[PDB]
């Protein structure tokens, strides 16, 4: 499952909070991202397939979401 590991690494890199200022993500989204990275990394480290698979779907969803995001407004 090296392909899945490579996919996760790419997704983690593409959801680097340091490069996402321009998207105006709220605290909840950023916490989702930090959690997803930790889960993905921990699943790779332990070679847990179900968790690696879940982590990929979660990160794919996040990446698509924040790349087509909800307009930032205070109401
Ligand atoms: Na921000
Ligand atoms: Na929370
Ligand atoms: Na299973």
Which residues contact residue 24 at a Cβ distance below 8 angstroms, ignoring those fewer than 6 apart?
69, 72
Domains belonging to the chain, first-starting first, are 1-75 (1.20.1270.10)
Residues 32 and 66: their CA atoms lie apart, in Å, by: 11
Experimental method: X-ray
Residue 60 Cα distances to 56, 73, 74, angstroms: 6, 25, 27
Stated resolution in angstroms:
1.5
Residues 16 and 64: their CA atoms lie apart, in Å, by: 14
Query: Which of helix, strand or coil describes residue 36?
Result: helix
Compute the distance from residue 71 Cα to the ligand 2 centre, in Å.
20
Which residues contact residue 32 at a Cβ distance below 8 angstroms, ignoring those fewer than 6 apart?
62
Q: In which element (H, E) is residue 12 found?
A: helix 2-13
Which residues contact residue 62 at a Cβ distance below 8 angstroms, ignoring those fewer than 6 apart?
15, 29, 32, 33, 36
Compute the distance from residue 50 Cα to the ligand 3 centre, in Å.
6
């Amino acid at each position: 499952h090296q392909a899945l590991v490579d996919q996760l690494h790419e997704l983690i890199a593409n959801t680097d909070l340091n490069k996402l200022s321009y998207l105006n993500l709220d605290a909840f989204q950023k916490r989702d991202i930090l959690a997803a990275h930790y889960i993905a990394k921990s699943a790779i480290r332990t070679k847990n397939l179900d968790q690696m698979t879940k982590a990929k779907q979660r990160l794919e969803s996040i990446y698509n979401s924040i790349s087509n995001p909800l307009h930032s407004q205070n109401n």
